[PDB]
Symmetry: C3
Subunit: 278 residues, 3 copies
């Protein structure tokens, strides 16, 4: 299993806010390439990221990040004049640090974790309209030595939608039996939810996997989440269970009935899925 290296170099990215089909709004790495969720940003602890951001909408937009260090000027709020006028640009700077023993003997928590970014000014001064229309995306900050996945998939419970999609339209994610699959799970909007995965489980801790025999973290397959919660994990696809179309869904009963459901399609090495209809 490939691991993350130590971090600490300055990076840059260009990010644009654009209007998408049906009045949805999204972030993209290039003009014309916006998505919901936004592009996945991956940093190692210690790295810095200057985000060259341009607003192409007819309303102000901003960029607010969870978990990472940033000055008040990268708050992404109107109150710290951190928002971007229509047609305007701005460079947001995010930083990350490693953990270590402080001067006072206490242990400073590193930046590592599953985080996210989103608008803070569309609709209201807390980004309610921005978030609803799709201005959010994931951010992973890794620790030196963190196991790397074969693939990462972002699942956002945005009010009563998954990734702003129409009810009962997934998304579905494919893997092969044995694949190390990373899930980033973010919630937004007004409602609480409970994320459930069939056939798989993870540890309720930073990485989603137990550090070893001495980790007392609960092993779960179901987790309550509220607006702006983020967590993540890695699983071995089909480990001890085999290939199949493995449901994931919100477990709030009316939410699953109304379409907060998707499929984690785990294929056999020949690419087929036993007992499934494609």
């Amino acid at each position: 299993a490939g691991a993350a290296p130590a971090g600490g170099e300055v990076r840059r990215v260009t990010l644009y806010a654009e209007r998408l089909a049906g009045g949805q709004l999204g972030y993209g790495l290039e003009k014309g390439k916006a998505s919901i969720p936004g592009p996945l940003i991956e940093l190692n602890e210690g790295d810095t990221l200057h985000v060259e951001f341009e607003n192409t909408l007819d309303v102000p937009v901003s960029l607010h990040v969870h978990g990472l260090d940033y000055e008040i000027s990268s708050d992404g709020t109107k109150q710290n004049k951190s928002h971007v006028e229509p047609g305007g640009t701005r460079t947001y700077t995010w930083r990350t640090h490693e953990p270590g023993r402080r001067a006072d003997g206490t242990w400073r928590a590193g930046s590592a974790g599953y985080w996210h970014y989103h608008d803070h000014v569309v609709g209201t001064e807390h980004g309610t309209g921005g978030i609803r229309n799709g201005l959010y995306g994931p951010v992973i900050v890794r620790r030196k030595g963190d196991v790397l996945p074969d693939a990462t998939h972002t699942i956002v419970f945005n009010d009563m939608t998954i990734n702003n999609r129409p009810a009962h339209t997934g998304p579905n994610f494919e893997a092969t039996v044995g694949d190390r699959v990373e899930i980033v799970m973010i919630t937004h909007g007004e409602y609480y939810h409970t994320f459930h995965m069939h056939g798989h489980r993870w540890a309720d801790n930073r990485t989603g996997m137990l550090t070893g025999p001495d980790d007392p973290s609960q092993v779960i397959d179901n987790k309550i989440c509220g607006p702006a919660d983020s967590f993540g994990f890695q699983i071995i696809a089909g480990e001890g269970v085999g290939a199949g179309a493995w449901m994931y869904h919100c477990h709030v009963q009316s939410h699953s009935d109304m379409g907060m459901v998707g499929l984690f399609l785990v294929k056999k090495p020949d690419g087929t899925i036993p007992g499934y209809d494609p």
Copy 2:
């Protein structure tokens, strides 16, 4: 009351889905003995359990389990043709595994924990109708060496009820001061809840007991929980607090007001509970 043995046996059990009185639906180990919650299934990591399931109802029913290992054919979903027709029988197979180091050097989590089973197919294709009406039950998978309890009690916040009971009708559970009591706590339905126990606290971790002095898990007496959450803990009945009628309730204020309350009745060795008058409760 001892320690869990290392698992590994092939077990078999017979499980039935049945109509109870008042339009409720339950699982039981024998016809005429269905209950809400269903029977407590208990396993040691490594055990294989073949659930010989019989659906005596006149609509399809299923059995979906959390946490344990199953092949997709024991998904218990219509979507994977794992439901049981009216009057039919089907063998569901659940497996469990010990933790251990993988070839890539990572640590694989074991099956141990507080889990549950429930219907996935009555009323809707997520079992909303079957869950609402009582088709759920607890599963405990023990890690080798886990401390065994003197008693285990299952408390299910199902919608606005506890174990599908009428408002303000318990259940109540009895212990003696010093008894090691295990609580399995499961939530189902539409609503978030907060589970609170007067006079007692636990660790927010796999077993509900701190591993030792190095375990940083929060110690709590109030825990938010949502549909399909399961957790558990073991407490020493009356430890440091004595005998009494110790309330457990949902702490969402209108929920307690409208019936989501019960009693942990902890008795002295002589079997008394001083001051306890059920007319005051």
Copy 3:
């Protein structure tokens, strides 16, 4: 510095009184009830006798989370430990250190972030009391726990913070470098998500990792429901510098309707950039 080993028998007087316009509160002296009520701080092993007095015209009580108490200090009508109007009562709370039981398992100590509230005003679960402000924080410290420069209590009570009007904070001040303690309690009817701009904490007992072996998730956003309590300590402006740092419920209509405040972090000269 750091918290000592506990074991004092301490006492405190507590009054329940009416405040302006329907509000009810606990106070250390009459005419000085606050919302939330006064902070109570103890060391594991400490015993506390609360000499309580009810100045209200209806029964009131005092129920506490987490601490040891015998049944007679439950603070419930059901078990006959409520206080009649104009009455008095002594409620006793005990705390204990961690240690190994006779049966060989580890008994969790009392240390943690806790709270106390009414259990009999309005309903026999204190629904009317909690609604109007009868709640307060309790911290029980473990020997060696690091002590903070300041402690601030934030209660999400239904759609208010600390029963204050919408969009009125509260706001709290600090200096860059300060070790700041937050106590976060929830009451009432709604779930919430507590968010802090510019800072993070560990989701464990103290809010800070014990060392490098601590696998607790590090977070800046936490879901909470009625009667949940937690707390943490942060070094103000650590790696982020000074400014008006927002905290709020992240449920979107809740922030929009005014569950917001400012963690005002001043530079050593006492000024806040952008403010």
